Design a binder for this molecule. Structure first.
Ligand SMILES: Nc1nc2c(c(=O)[nH]1)N[C@H]1C(S)=C(S)[C@@H](COP(=O)(O)OP(=O)(O)OC[C@H]3O[C@@H](n4cnc5c(=O)[nH]c(N)nc54)[C@H](O)[C@@H]3O)O[C@H]1N2
Ligand SMILES: Nc1nc2c(c(=O)[nH]1)N[C@H]1C(S)=C(S)[C@@H](COP(=O)(O)OP(=O)(O)OC[C@H]3O[C@@H](n4cnc5c(=O)[nH]c(N)nc54)[C@H](O)[C@@H]3O)O[C@H]1N2
Ligand code: SF4
Ligand SMILES: [Mo+4]
Length: 697
């Protein structure tokens, strides 16, 4: 019996886990003394390791490569040699004929690791010769990045997760850590425990709200309105940090100009918050010696999402809550490694280390390092643009690794036809997902407990995770697959281990250079920038101490006018629909749902939080399956009646097989519940056998 140290592959909290191995199998998992979790794990880290053993509760783990040698296809098992040769040849042929930009590749924000993301972007750039690399996941706060990037020059959490504990005030906005990042919620509770004030801006009465000094339950979608009003009060009452605004920012006057009209009274009906509440929240935020803002999707998944991010960052600027510890602007994003995949350059406009491909010097260094004449300089296509690029014949092949767009992208039928429009779709995954079943070629890889690497936690903290068990089938790591394809296409690539990949990149990225494997060790948490390999350099806790990373080093102010959501509530669709998380289960459902204990927790079709009062009116009972109506939309879900959601809006999840946070719908009860249940079991059985029939063939 031995314990192998790893990092949770669920959410970005970065909890260290000791996987206990006995014989050649993982026996159980227990918390380790990581930087962030310090001996605590939530339900998913504790029980979510089971999926590695191919339980088949939902879908089987991929065991062999496959090729569908005819669109009306029999996806048939094949040797690695046939798969790899097939891909390298198709890609070469597509490239020569239509050009490198005719192929699209994806990074992956899950259990694969940073190293393989560096290998895929290298593959796209040095081998195919395109900048078409991108992560879907990087919509975990896609808007956050550039939005935040224009205000501050860096889209990362400005301060450490561990710095939260000592904030004087936590400003939670469109963020529900209790379900989303359990271990980060603990840091917030500990902050309150150390004596911090807490303000929660959220429509729903989430867990955090109950410990909050002030719960600002604004109306779904009234974001910029309240934000402008708060900025208004802060300036009106002279609560801003003038010295800071003068020496470190730009844009005050134009911001001030706009927020002027946004008096608290003027926005009481739009936000549904009383002016005194607004003023009080604004003063509490302004009065705190140090305040930290944490946000999530309730900010980004809105048309005015990108605006709200910059609008919040402005409050932080106004109050000089940047450049010091226990403060900051902190988008706590989703996946265990959404941060890493970005840090590794799995983006169409930067090499790893946030070294823009548009810089001739950056290209010179990389092209030299990669032993290549020229590296493309123009931005690549974004994975979100696939349907469109495929339809118009601009991208002829998609190399999708560790993503499930045929389950996760909006209006999935769109991606089904893109797949239909593409000449070739390669899907490299760990499970027979809906996306994998639609592919032309499946390339099976190792999973999280079967390989090693590094992940970057929510706050840019690099961490090592180790291989705890061998794959039981003939699998290759994602980077071995890409490397061999690269080699068969004429570009020599092979690595003996992930440290070979890491050291290579360390040498090509100044801000990552000091974070050696040794420094990270089994429990080191090293936040970049980490420039010197010397033990004296343990990383950077908070960003912007001296300057701001914007071209002229000053943060940039911004807000705009509040604009009501696109979905007009009607007498026909009187309710607002918004999605939300819940522990137990995790996004894609492929891992969480293939764990015996976790699958026991989540029911099909899944819940829809409905407000006690709303339900009564509509004649909807708790646990009762229900109908949710929209334009060209009707979904069946189980009602979870409660006082938590706010009257007028229902909150479903999406972890079941664009202004995503606001949608006008009409919830209606079901009479023949028994005919509804059977329908659900029926559809679920159908999909399950489908995927099974695809893999087990
Ligand atoms: N409609 C809609 N679209 C969205 C969002 C939304 O909420 N709604 N949100 C955005 C956000 S925040 C996110 S997080 C994304 C999420 O969407 P995706 O990026 O698709 O994320 P997952 O669905 O978690 O898919 C990860 C896949 O990688 C596979 N995988 C896991 N480990 C490995 C590995 O080691 N190797 C390989 N090759 N594969 C592996 C898993 O089995 C799974 O199939 O979508 C974004 N776009
Ligand atoms: N258990 C579990 N945890 C997860 C995941 C999972 O699948 N399961 N997925 C991970 C991933 S990939 C992601 S992207 C994150 C997403 O997690 P979060 O960023 O926490 O996002 P949600 O819970 O979807 O929405 C956050 C909050 O925004 C609030 N909100 C909605 N509309 C508004 C608004 O108009 N204004 C304001 N102020 N608030 C609003 C909602 O009530 C909700 O409480 O979770 C991650 N953690
Ligand atoms: S908080 Fe997140 S990273 Fe930690 S054990 Fe739970 S799912 Fe894993
Ligand atoms: Mo996400």
């Amino acid at each position: 019996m031995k314990k192998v140290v790893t990092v949770c592959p669920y959410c970005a909290s970065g909890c260290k886990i000791n996987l206990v191995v006995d014989n050649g199998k993982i026996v159980r998992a227990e918390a380790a003394q990581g930087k962030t979790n310090q001996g605590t794990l939530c339900l998913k880290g504790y029980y979510g390791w089971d999926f590695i053993n191919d339980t088949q509760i939902l879908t089987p783990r991929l065991k062999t490569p496959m090729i569908r040698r005819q669109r009306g296809g029999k996806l048939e098992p094949v040797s690695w040699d046939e798969a790899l040769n097939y891909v390298a040849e198709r890609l070469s042929a597509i490239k020569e004929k239509y050009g490198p930009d005719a192929i699209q590749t994806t990074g992956s924000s899950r259990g694969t690791g940073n190293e393989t993301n560096y290998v895929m972007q290298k593959f796209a750039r040095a081998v195919i010769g395109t900048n078409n690399v991108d992560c879907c996941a990087r919509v975990x706060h896609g808007p956050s990045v550039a939005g935040l990037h224009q205000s501050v020059g860096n889209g990362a959490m400005s301060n450490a997760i561990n710095e939260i504990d000592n904030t004087d005030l936590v400003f939670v906005f469109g963020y529900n850590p209790a379900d989303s990042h359990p271990i980060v919620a603990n840091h917030v509770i500990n902050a309150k425990r150390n004596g911090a004030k807490i303000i929660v801006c959220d429509p729903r009465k989430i867990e955090t709200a109950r410990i909050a000094d002030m719960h600002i339950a604004l109306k779904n979608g009234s974001n910029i309105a309240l934000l402008n009003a708060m900025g208004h009060v802060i300036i009106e009452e002279n609560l801003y940090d003038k010295a800071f605004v003068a020496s470190r920012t730009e844009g005050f006057e134009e911001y001030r100009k706009i927020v002027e009209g946004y008096t608290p009274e003027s926005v009481e009906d739009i936000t549904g918050v009383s002016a005194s509440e607004i003023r009080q929240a604004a003063r509490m935020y302004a009065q705190a010696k140090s305040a930290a803002i944490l946000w999530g999707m309730g900010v980004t998944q809105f048309y005015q999402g990108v605006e709200t991010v910059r609008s919040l960052t402005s409050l932080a600027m106004l109050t000089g809550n940047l450049g010091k510890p226990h403060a900051g602007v902190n988008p706590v994003r989703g996946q265990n490694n959404v941060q890493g995949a970005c840090d590794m350059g799995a983006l169409p406009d930067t090499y790893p280390g946030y070294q823009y491909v548009k810089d001739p010097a950056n290209r010179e260094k990389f092209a030299k390092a990669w032993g290549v004449e020229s590296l493309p300089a123009h931005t690549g296509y974004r994975i979100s643009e696939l349907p469109h690029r495929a339809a118009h014949g601009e991208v002829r092949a998609a190399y999708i690794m560790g993503e499930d767009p045929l389950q996760t992208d909006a209006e999935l039928s769109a991606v089904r036809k893109a797949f239909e429009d593409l000449e070739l779709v390669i899907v490299q995954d760990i499970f027979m997902t809906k996306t994998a079943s639609a592919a032309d070629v499946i390339l099976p890889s190792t999973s999280w407990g079967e390989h090693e690497g590094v992940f970057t936690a929510a706050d840019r903290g690099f961490q090592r995770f180790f291989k705890a068990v061998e794959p039981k089938w003939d699998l290759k790591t994602d980077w071995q697959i890409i490397s061999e394809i690269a080699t068969r296409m004429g570009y020599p690539m092979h690595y003996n281990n992930t440290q070979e990949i890491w050291d290579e990149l360390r040498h090509l990225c100044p801000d990552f250079y000091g974070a050696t494997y040794e420094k990270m060790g089994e429990l080191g948490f090293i936040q970049w920038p980490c420039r010197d390999t010397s033990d004296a350099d343990q990383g950077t806790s908070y960003l912007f101490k001296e300057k701001f990373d914007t071209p002229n080093g000053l943060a940039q102010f911004f807000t705009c006018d509040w604009v009501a959501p696109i979905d007009k509530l009607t007498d026909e669709y009187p309710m607002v629909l918004s999605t939300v998380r819940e522990v137990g289960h995790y996004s894609c459902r492929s891992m969480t749902g293939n764990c015996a204990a976790l699958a026991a927790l989540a029911d099909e079709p899944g819940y829809a939080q409905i407000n006690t009062e709303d339900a009564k009116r509509l004649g909807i009972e708790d646990e009762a399956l229900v109908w949710v109506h929209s334009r060209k939309g009707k979904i069946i879900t189980r009602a979870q009646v409660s006082d938590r959601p706010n009257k007028g809006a229902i909150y479903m999840t999406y972890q079941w097989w664009p202004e995503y946070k606001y949608c006008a719908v009409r919830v209606e009860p079901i009479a023949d519940q028994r005919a509804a249940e059977q329908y659900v079991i029926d559809e679920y059985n159908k999909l399950k056998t489908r995927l099974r029939e695809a893999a087990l063939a």
